[PDB]
């Protein structure tokens, strides 16, 4: 059947195309920022500790001393 | 000579007493002059400093209180 052929063929073509888009987009979208995120965040720990963690340090130091 | 030195040193004693009173009252005037308003000004500015610390202390309290 040519109508059934057209239906399943076009529909599965769309699915295959969308899945190729899925693979590429998902991989880049979730890979590229991830490294940048964790790098900036380990540095963020190194920075935020110098405002907040030191605040806890000074507080403990004074209250205990 | 005897009674002479007696009266002389007696007058010296009285004069010295009055001098001691003068120095004493001078110290009294110095304290009563402006020392009290001076420390009042000191405490006033100190009070302002406490108003300064009134802000940042809240954050230290917050750190202790998570």
Swiss-Prot record, chain A:
GO molecular function: microtubule plus-end binding
Annotated compartments: Chromosome, Centromere, Kinetochore; Cytoplasm, Cytoskeleton, Spindle; Nucleus
Disulphide-bridged cysteine pairs: none
Segment forming the signal sequence: none
Alphabetical keyword list: Cell cycle, Cell division, Centromere, Chromosome, Chromosome partition, Cytoplasm, Cytoskeleton, Kinetochore, Microtubule, Mitosis, Nucleus
GO cellular component, one term: kinetochore
Predominant subcellular localization, coarse grouping: nucleus
GO BP term, pick one: cell division
Functional description taken from the UniProt entry: Component of the DASH complex that connects microtubules with kinetochores and couples microtubule depolymerisation to chromosome movement; it is involved in retrieving kinetochores to the spindle poles before their re-orientation on the spindle in early mitosis and allows microtubule depolymerization to pull chromosomes apart and resist detachment during anaphase.
Subunit structure, as described in the record: Component of the DASH complex consisting of ASK1, DAD1, DAD2, DAD3, DAD4, DAM1, DUO1, HSK3, SPC19 and SPC34, with a stoichiometry of one copy of each subunit per complex. Multiple DASH complexes oligomerize to form a ring that encircles spindle microtubules and organizes the rod-like NDC80 complexes of the outer kinetochore. DASH complex oligomerization strengthens microtubule attachments. On cytoplasmic microtubules, DASH complexes appear to form patches instead of rings.
Family designation: Belongs to the DASH complex DAD3 family.
Full protein name: DASH complex subunit DAD3
UniProt organism field: Chaetomium thermophilum (strain DSM 1495 / CBS 144.50 / IMI 039719) (Thermochaetoides thermophila)
The encoding gene: DAD3
Shown segment, full-protein numbering: 18 to 82 of 95
UniProtKB/Swiss-Prot annotation, chain B:
Residues spanning the membrane: none
Domain of life, source organism: Eukaryota
Protein location: Chromosome, Centromere, Kinetochore; Cytoplasm, Cytoskeleton, Spindle; Nucleus
Entry similarity comment: Belongs to the DASH complex ASK1 family.
Subunit structure of this chain's protein: Component of the DASH complex consisting of ASK1, DAD1, DAD2, DAD3, DAD4, DAM1, DUO1, HSK3, SPC19 and SPC34, with a stoichiometry of one copy of each subunit per complex. Multiple DASH complexes oligomerize to form a ring that encircles spindle microtubules and organizes the rod-like NDC80 complexes of the outer kinetochore. On cytoplasmic microtubules, DASH complexes appear to form patches instead of rings.
Described function: Component of the DASH complex that connects microtubules with kinetochores and couples microtubule depolymerisation to chromosome movement; it is involved in retrieving kinetochores to the spindle poles before their re-orientation on the spindle in early mitosis and allows microtubule depolymerization to pull chromosomes apart and resist detachment during anaphase.
UniProt name for this protein: DASH complex subunit ASK1
Lineage of the organism: Eukaryota, Fungi, Dikarya, Ascomycota, Pezizomycotina
């Amino acid at each position: 059947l040519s109508p059934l052929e057209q239906e399943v063929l076009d529909e599965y073509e769309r699915l295959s195309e969308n899945m190729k888009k899925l693979a590429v987009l998902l991989d880049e979208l979730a890979s590229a920022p991830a490294t940048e995120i964790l790098d900036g965040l380990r540095e963020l720990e190194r920075k935020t500790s110098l405002v907040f963690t030191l605040l806890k340090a000074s507080v403990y130091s004074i209250v205990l001393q | 000579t005897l009674t002479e030195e007696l009266e002389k040193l007696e007058q010296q004693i009285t004069l010295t007493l009055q001098e001691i009173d003068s120095n004493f009252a001078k110290a009294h005037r110095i304290v009563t002059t402006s020392i009290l308003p001076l420390v009042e000004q000191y405490g006033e500015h100190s009070r302002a400093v406490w108003e300064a610390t009134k802000f940042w202390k809240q954050f230290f309290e917050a750190s202790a209180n998570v």
